[PDB]
Amino acid sequence: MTDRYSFSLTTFSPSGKLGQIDYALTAVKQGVTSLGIKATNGVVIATEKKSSSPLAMSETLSKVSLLTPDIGAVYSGMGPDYRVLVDKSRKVAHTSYKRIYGEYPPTKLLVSEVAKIMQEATQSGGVRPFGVSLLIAGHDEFNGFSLYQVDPSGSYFPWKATAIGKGSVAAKTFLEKRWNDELELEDAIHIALLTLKESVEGEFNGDTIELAIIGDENPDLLGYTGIPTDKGPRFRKLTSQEINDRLEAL
């Protein structure tokens, strides 16, 4: 018995390719389109809620996830792989940072820790790479707003705006035309909805679209009052109603 697979399942081919990473990227390509846009006073991340069945309740399946009060994540590729990464990403934010410094990690460092986990699945014994690409939007005091992409290899890059998955090539072209360095948050949400309509085929409304922002602090979402320094989470998931309001003036 016992895990006898103590050897790497990802190796270099004669051409210098790491096969399993390339194939994991191919799995990401098949996945549903998701995107992220960075504004001056915020960040938006969005994706389509591909429903497996109309009997299925798509509210229960959350593609956009809170990692910390000021950091959110979205993906393209294999959903189960994403779910466990979010679990590990949330835990590592506490174990390797908050339990040491008494505060939540900045975006770049949490991203770094997630990347480390995805890199180890590329080199450790008896495991395949993760079949997902993550887009992580976040805010912290000293770096401000930021947006990062994380690939199956464990590589990560900062972006002003980008898209991943099914129609990423067309979506990235669309974002290049519309993006400027003076964009307000509302303008970035508007562009995100425009960009996402291109890749979506069926219904396009608040129930088929999942969208969240990293913006101003939300004292109403904190859950308590009495500590002036604690002003609430910057991560907010837009409601089904809030999306439909912006679709009328589209």
Partner: protein
């Protein structure tokens, strides 16, 4: 059992070569070029970013050049994720030495240990090697300014000027042509950029597709300063040498 699926990463070919090491080097040869040039009064590190997109955040980015401690920096060529594993190990090894001896780590010692880790992955454990080549640029009070390189085989060597990654053959010929021993930092800066400008696969070399760093004794009296160049500072140095 599981024997069926084992690639056997740590074996010899009939010719006496390590398959995985050779293939890891083939991987590195497609990565963005990184150049190191050592002058008498400092060291230059230059590196070309891999095909940049216009919407990539350039100012708050780190792909090629990493800081190990206050006196030592590295230029990366290969898998970034792999490099970051090794960098955090190197950063820790430097602080262990400082904690033990109350002295900053000698450059060669740090390089040797990092290279010994890579060696281990080629001889035992059955795992794939790290697909990374480093250029180490650093200073200590024994040997002064030093340039090293290490590769997936775990073999390291010292250099006056060296390139890793893509087009090293062409880059090494150009460095071998124009380099001389009495060279200054400002001259080495110009050489590093001119070399990348000719060996680049891009149409024209611009500020947004470069990372740059110097290690001078240009601070105040007998002390070393690390300067990781900002985007605007790369833009200015590129105009000053007459490339753009």
């Amino acid at each position: 059992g599981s024997r069926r699926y084992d690639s056997r990463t740590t074996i010899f070919s009939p010719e006496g070569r390590l398959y995985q090491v050779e293939y890891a080097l083939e991987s590195i040869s497609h990565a963005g070029t990184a150049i190191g040039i050592m002058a008498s009064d400092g060291i230059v590190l230059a590196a070309e970013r891999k095909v940049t997109s216009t919407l990539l955040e350039q100012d708050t980015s780190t792909e090629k050049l990493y800081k190990l401690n206050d006196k030592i920096a590295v230029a990366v060529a290969g898998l970034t994720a792999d490099a970051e594993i090794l960098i955090n190990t190197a950063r820790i090894h430097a602080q262990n030495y400082l904690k033990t001896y109350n002295e900053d780590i000698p450059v060669e010692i740090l390089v040797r240990r990092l290279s010994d880790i890579k060696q281990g992955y080629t001889q035992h454990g059955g795992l794939r090697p790290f697909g990374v080549s480093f250029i180490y640029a650093g200073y200590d009070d024994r040997y002064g300014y030093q340039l090293y390189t290490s590769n997936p085989s775990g073999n390291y060597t010292g250099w006056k000027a060296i390139s890793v990654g893509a087009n090293t053959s062409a880059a090494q010929t150009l460095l071998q042509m124009d380099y001389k021993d009495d060279m200054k930092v400002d001259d080495a800066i110009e050489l590093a950029l001119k070399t990348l400008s000719k060996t680049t696969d891009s149409s024209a070399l611009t500020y947004d597709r470069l990372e740059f760093a110097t290690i001078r004794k240009g601070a105040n009296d007998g002390e070393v300063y690390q300067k990781i160049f900002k985007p605007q500072e790369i833009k200015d140095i590129l105009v000053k040498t007459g490339i753009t």
